[PDB]
Structure formats: structure tokens, C-alpha cells
Design an enzyme around this catalytic site. Sequence first.
Site, PDB file in Angstrom:
ATOM      1  N   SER A 166       0.779  -1.269   0.000  1.00  0.00           N
ATOM      2  CA  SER A 166       0.000   0.000   0.000  1.00  0.00           C
ATOM      3  C   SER A 166       0.810   1.319   0.000  1.00  0.00           C
ATOM      4  O   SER A 166       0.215   2.397  -0.100  1.00  0.00           O
ATOM      5  CB  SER A 166      -0.985  -0.018   1.182  1.00  0.00           C
ATOM      6  N   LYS A 168       0.168   3.867  -2.799  1.00  0.00           N
ATOM      7  CA  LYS A 168      -0.845   4.929  -2.661  1.00  0.00           C
ATOM      8  C   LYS A 168      -0.234   6.339  -2.585  1.00  0.00           C
ATOM      9  O   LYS A 168      -0.848   7.302  -3.050  1.00  0.00           O
ATOM     10  CB  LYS A 168      -1.752   4.632  -1.467  1.00  0.00           C
ATOM     11  N   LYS A 189       3.042   6.390   5.274  1.00  0.00           N
ATOM     12  CA  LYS A 189       2.078   5.469   4.701  1.00  0.00           C
ATOM     13  C   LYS A 189       2.521   4.019   4.957  1.00  0.00           C
ATOM     14  O   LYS A 189       3.693   3.680   4.750  1.00  0.00           O
ATOM     15  CB  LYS A 189       1.993   5.715   3.207  1.00  0.00           C
ATOM     16  N   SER A 234      -5.866   3.738   4.103  1.00  0.00           N
ATOM     17  CA  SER A 234      -5.333   2.812   3.061  1.00  0.00           C
ATOM     18  C   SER A 234      -6.460   2.209   2.241  1.00  0.00           C
ATOM     19  O   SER A 234      -6.548   0.979   2.112  1.00  0.00           O
ATOM     20  CB  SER A 234      -4.472   1.673   3.626  1.00  0.00           C
TER      21      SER A 234
END
Length: 442
Positions: A35, A38, A390, A279
Site C-alpha cells: 500500500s 498509494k 504510509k 489505506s
Amino acid sequence: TQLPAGANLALMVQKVGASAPAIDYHSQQMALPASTQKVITALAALIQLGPDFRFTTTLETKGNVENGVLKGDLVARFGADPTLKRQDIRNMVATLKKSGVNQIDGNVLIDTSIFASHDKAPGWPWNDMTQCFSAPPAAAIVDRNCFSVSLYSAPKPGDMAFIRVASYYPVTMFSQVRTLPRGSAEAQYCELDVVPGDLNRFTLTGCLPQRSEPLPLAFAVQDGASYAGAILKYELKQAGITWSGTLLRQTQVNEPGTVVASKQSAPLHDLLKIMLKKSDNMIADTVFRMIGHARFNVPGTWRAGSDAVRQILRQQAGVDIGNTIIADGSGLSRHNLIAPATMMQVLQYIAQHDNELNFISMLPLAGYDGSLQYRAGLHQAGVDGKVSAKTGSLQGVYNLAGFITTASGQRMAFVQYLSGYAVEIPLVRFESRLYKDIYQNN
Ligand SMILES: *C(=O)[C@@H](NC(=O)COc1ccccc1)[C@@H]1N[C@@H](C(=O)O)C(C)(C)S1
């Protein structure tokens, strides 16, 4: 490394605006980003679509309305809005009725022409496709294309376990599940499976041990167009609107009719904030195919999204991603491949333009929100409120990419790509040491 036998770490830590890293450990080695992908999706989206972009859905009429009768087709033009809800359909239909249409002498078209090709990215494991986190991010989404079901064991073992589902969900459930005597050992290797079929059919198969309470299950809609169409059909009927034709899919690009009703999502910056805080795969992936659609003026596909993101990075952000592979927006794909040094250039660009992008405020803040509200490693490092980053989590993948403000007040960007993680707290011990180190010594 307090790390399990055989885990793979690629790590880079670098002062914002500096040309050499403070920590450089296999930073050039390609890895699965999960993820953290992203971060790239959010930057390309802001550059291509801008903070004020909104997804839109419309009801359009093609033809004249005579005496409350539409002489022509009703077109429901979907726009990949990840936040569209059943109520939005109901309201748009209410608006159609109020505008003077009581009857459609023609067809109801479910238009998904904004996108083409498969609603599933290359490299997504087939087995997770029925789970909501991997729901196909189609052009037609209603209530996240996820629905729930209750599975009840039968009072007599040997009898079929039975399925309860809310009547409004336009799915078809079948049970071939055998209820087991709550001891004996068909239980060990008899699986409980979901098997999706065409037109949003799902068959449960295998075995279920007797339970006093029903098993709650949530599944992903496989055919969003059919699902959205059935919801639309229901809402039309409830509002008293009749039609003589049938529900048909419209996939080819076509001139819009008269917009009689519409819904727009919240602004893109707001959606990207949810996306980075939580997320949100579905927001990341509808954005991703939207980027390609907008850059190249073609129906959005995974390949057009990939090409567009690479072009945007190189041309607007000055980052040549080289042999990096970008397969989707969410990081779900096992085909995504990028080195910490490449993600570092993206992070440096973001930090340098943060006053323009308002990007860093959207990342989870350790100890406060989103995915980092309690990351034990970060809490124990003493860096709550000091890390905006993140996460990237997949089976045996524990990544982190973002920013840390250190004890001297220096902002450093970092990328921790940790994979091949497999078990027979090592992470927690690893992270608490590393980030305490980084914070304390910089
Ligand atoms: C990004 O990494 C996304 N991860 C996934 O879609 C799948 O996550 C896992 C699958 C199997 C085993 C462990 C994780 C998003 N990030 C996840 C997270 O935990 O933050 C998610 C589940 C919200 S999706």
C-alpha cells in the site's frame, strides 16, 4: 535486525533536500511496495486531476418527454465514484420523477463507458477477489460493492447450513454447506469456500461446524454493472416509473444526453485524505484508472493508468521511475515493483512541494490517526507525533514510507521495505530500535 529468519530489508533515510542519504541499506533493490503505492497514486492524482476533482454519476435522457413519457432511453452514466450509495440512486430517481418522467418508452442503459477492459488489475491473487478489500473497483459502485450475509449451521448435522441475506442486496446466494457434528474430523481439512458465479451468484460449499451463533461473512460484488442496474431497477419501480424495454449495459463511448439528475463526490483532496489515512484500496484504484482516462482521453484501463502515472512522475515531478513496475493504484498487485531510492525521489518531491500539495497532512500521524494510531514500534521509539507515513501491509510485508521530524528538528524522508517476513514482536523490536535511532541521532 531483530527480524525473523530470512526477512528481506531495503531501507533508505535521507534529509529533506539533501543529495546523500543518512541510512542506505540495499536502497537500489526493487521490492514489493504494497500500500505505499498509494503515495504515488495520490501525487499523480493531485497533479493530473487536481484537489477539486469530483467523481460524478448522472441520469440522462435521450429523447423527448411527452405527457410524462420519455420517448427514448434512460441512461445511468456511472463515473467510478467509490463513495456512491444506494440513497444516491434513490435520490437521483426521485429527481427524475419530479422532472416529469413517469414512464420510459425505451431501454434503461447502465453506462460504464468511462472505463474499459477488466475491473481487476494484473497480479491480483484470484483467491482474495471475493473479499471486500479486493472488490473489483468498477465504474459502477454502490455501497462499495460489498455486502454481508449470515451463515447458520443446521440443527441436524448432515443438513444444509443456511444463508440469510438482506432482501435489498441484489445478489443470489446458494448453500451447499454441510453442517458438521461439532467434534469429528471432517473439520480438519474440509474447507468453507465461496464460489462466485455470473450475475452476482455466490455458492457457499464445504463444511461448517455446528455453532450457536451464525457466521457473519462479507463478500465483494463481482459484476458491479449488474448490481447497480438491479438497484436502479428497484428504485425506479418504487418511485412508480415504468419502462417497456430492458436493462442493457452501455460500454462504448457516446455523447451525453440531457442530465436530469446527478451526484458528485466530495473533492479529490478529501477522498485522497481518507485514502491515505485508512489505506482505502477502492479509492486508490478508481482514482488510478481515472488518471489514465483524463490524461489520454480514452476509457480508463489499468494499462492507461500505469502509463499515465509514469508520464506524470517524469514530466511534472522530474522523477524517472526507470524499470519500476506500476500495476495499480492501491498497491494490492504482486506485480508492483519499486526500489526505496525511487520511492525516495517521490517523497523528496512531495516534501519540496508540500506547501502547494498539502500532502503530508493527509498521511497517518503516528499516535493520532489512520493506520499509525498505535504502531507499537513507533510508539516505543518515542516518535508519536513525529512520523507521518504510509503503511504497506501484505502477507509477510511490512512497509513504511514517509517523513520523520528528528530530535534536532530536521525533517528526514524514509522508506522501509520489509518483506519475506514469515513466522515459524520481532518487527516491533526492529522498528522501536530503528526509529529511536533515527530520531535521536539526527
Ligand atoms: C495495502 O497494503 C493494502 N493491503 C491489502 O489490501 C491487503 O492487506 C493484507 C492482506 C493479507 C495479509 C495482511 C494484509 C491496504 N492496507 C491494509 C492495512 O492493513 O492497512 C488494509 C487491509 C486496510 S488494505
